[PDB]
Amino acid sequence: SIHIEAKQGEIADKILLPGDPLRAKFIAENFLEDAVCFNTVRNMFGYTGTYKGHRVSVMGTGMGMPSISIYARELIVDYGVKTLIRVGTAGAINPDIHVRELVLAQAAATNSNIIRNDWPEFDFPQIADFKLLDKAYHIAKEMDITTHVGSVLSSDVFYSNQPDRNMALGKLGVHAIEMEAAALYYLAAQHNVNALAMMTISDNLNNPEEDTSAEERQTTFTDMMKVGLETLISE
Numbered sequence: 001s002i003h004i005e006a007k008q009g010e011i012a013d014k015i016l017l018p019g020d021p022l023r024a025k026f027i028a029e030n031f032l033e034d035a036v037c038f039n040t041v042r043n044m045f046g047y048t049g050t051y052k053g054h055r056v057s058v059m060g061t062g063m064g065m066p067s068i069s070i071y072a073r074e075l076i077v078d079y080g081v082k083t084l085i086r087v088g089t090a091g092a093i094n095p096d097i098h099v100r101e102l103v104l105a106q107a108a109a110t111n112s113n114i115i116r117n118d119w120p121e122f123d124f125p126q127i128a129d130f131k132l133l134d135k136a137y138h139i140a141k142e143m144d145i146t147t148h149v150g151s152v153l154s155s156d157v158f159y160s161n162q163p164d165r166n167m168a169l170g171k172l173g174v175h176a177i178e179m180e181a182a183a184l185y186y187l188a189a190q191h192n193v194n195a196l197a198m199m200t201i202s203d204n205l206n207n208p209e210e211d212t213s214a215e216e217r218q219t220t221f222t223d224m225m226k227v228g229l230e231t232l233i234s235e
Contacts, residue, residue: 001078003041003070010038012048012055014083014232015075017068019180021045021060028058031225044071054233061086065112065154065183072187072195084188085132086197087228090152090178093170095206100220101146102227104128104136105197108181109174110154115186126154126185132196136231145223150175152199154182167205176201196231200224 004011018024021044028035028047035049039059046059059075061068068086075081090103097103108126115124133149140147151174153166158179160166166177181197188195200220204210 001074003044004039004046004074004078005041006038006046006079008079010048011046011075011079011081012057013081014054014056015081015085016056016058016228016232017061017072017084017086017184018058019061019063019088024058024060027225031229032056032058051229051233056229056232057081061180064156064179065110065114068180069114069183069187072184076187076191076193082193083132083232084184084193084195085228085232086180086184086195086199087224088178088180088197088199089202090176090199091203091205092176092201093153093167093205094148094150094173094175095170097148097175097201097204099201099204099210099212100216101148101201102140102224103152103175103199103201104133104140104147104149105152105181105199106133106149107151108154108185108197109151109169110156110182112154112156112182114183126182126189128185128196129188129194132194132231135234136196136198136227139230140227143223143227145227148175152181152197153177155179170206177205198224198228
């Protein structure tokens with residue numbers, strides 16, 4: 001509420017969180033059944049529908065950690081959401097990681113200040129809920145999806161002034177760069193709920209001429225959606 005106009009009962013307790021409101025709309029119309037809209041405020045589309053009989057929601061979060069922090073907080077605190085899965089795109093910085101592959105974020109590095117401001121004495125890692133991470137991995141492997149489990153970097157600055165520094169992380173077990181996961185993981189830890197972030201590599205920052213084919217782009221997305229949805233409804 002304040003940023004979400006939904007009444008109580010309109011949002012399921014388990015939600016998929018793409019960055020793009022139009023992606024949410026796309027998921028709602030093609031992977032859920034009987035999906036209906038629950039939010040239009042600031043054009044941040046959200047839908048509740050059914051997957052394999054399970055009530056499931058999906059909504060966009062906008063870009064960057066402040067944005068997703070606002071929406072995840074309201075979902076958790078005002079609508080009692082307990083399971084949250086980010087499904088998104090990222091750029092690969094680990095050279096062994098190629099375009100279209102799947103990354104599951106065991107942890108999220110960040111150059112943000114959101115955690116450090118609250119915890120100045122610490123390096124305080126933001127982590128995925130293990131059981132979610134482990135279920136997603138098992139499901140992905142059954143589908144023979146090329147999957148990588150590791151850290152991602154949740155960055156504040158898409159147009160970075162220090163890209164070499166970012167790239168150097170790729171040699172130390174940090175797979176891909178994204179903008180949201182650390183914030184989501186932090187809120188989940190604060191409110192004791194369960195979060196996972198997953199992404200397909202859309203760009204290989206180590207190899208710019210690694211291209212993708214759109215149709216291929218929709219197979220991969222379909223693959224990720226089912227990992228995402230099966231993980232979301234597993235109990």
